[PDB]
Structure 1
Amino acid sequence: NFNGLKGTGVLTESNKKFLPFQQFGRDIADTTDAVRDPQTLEILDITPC
């Protein structure tokens, strides 16, 4: 539950590089799969079951 983003899946460490203004990450399906944890500033990767 990331700021209202209620989802289910597995969370890995994402190696891609974002920008200071960037906060999310989409795909062809336009569903969020790469997120930024507000407290610790690494990048998480979301993969469904």
Structure 2
Amino acid sequence: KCVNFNFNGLTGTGVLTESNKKFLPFQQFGRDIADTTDAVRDPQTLEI
């Protein structure tokens, strides 16, 4: 669903979808070359 998502770092619009991407355990947020956030880790649990 397309909803407003804020986890501690930003307020924006997007659709959350599970994927096979893998992030380092010490990494939280990430962006593409266009300087827009395409992924956010779940704060409480482990999810990408």
Both structures adopt the same fold (TM-score exceeding 0.5): yes
1 or 2 for the larger relative contact order (CA 8 Å, sep ≥6)? 1
Alignment TM-score, normalising by the size of structure 2 = 0.73
Kindly, what percent of the aligned residue pairs are identical? 98
Higher strand share: 2
Runs (4 or more) in structure 1 with deviation over 4 Å come to: none
* Number of equivalent positions: 42
Alignment TM-score, normalising by the size of structure 1 = 0.72
In the aligned structure 2, how far is the partner of 1:4 from the partner of 1:19? 18
Q: What stretches of structure 1 of length at least 5 have no aligned partner?
A: 43-49
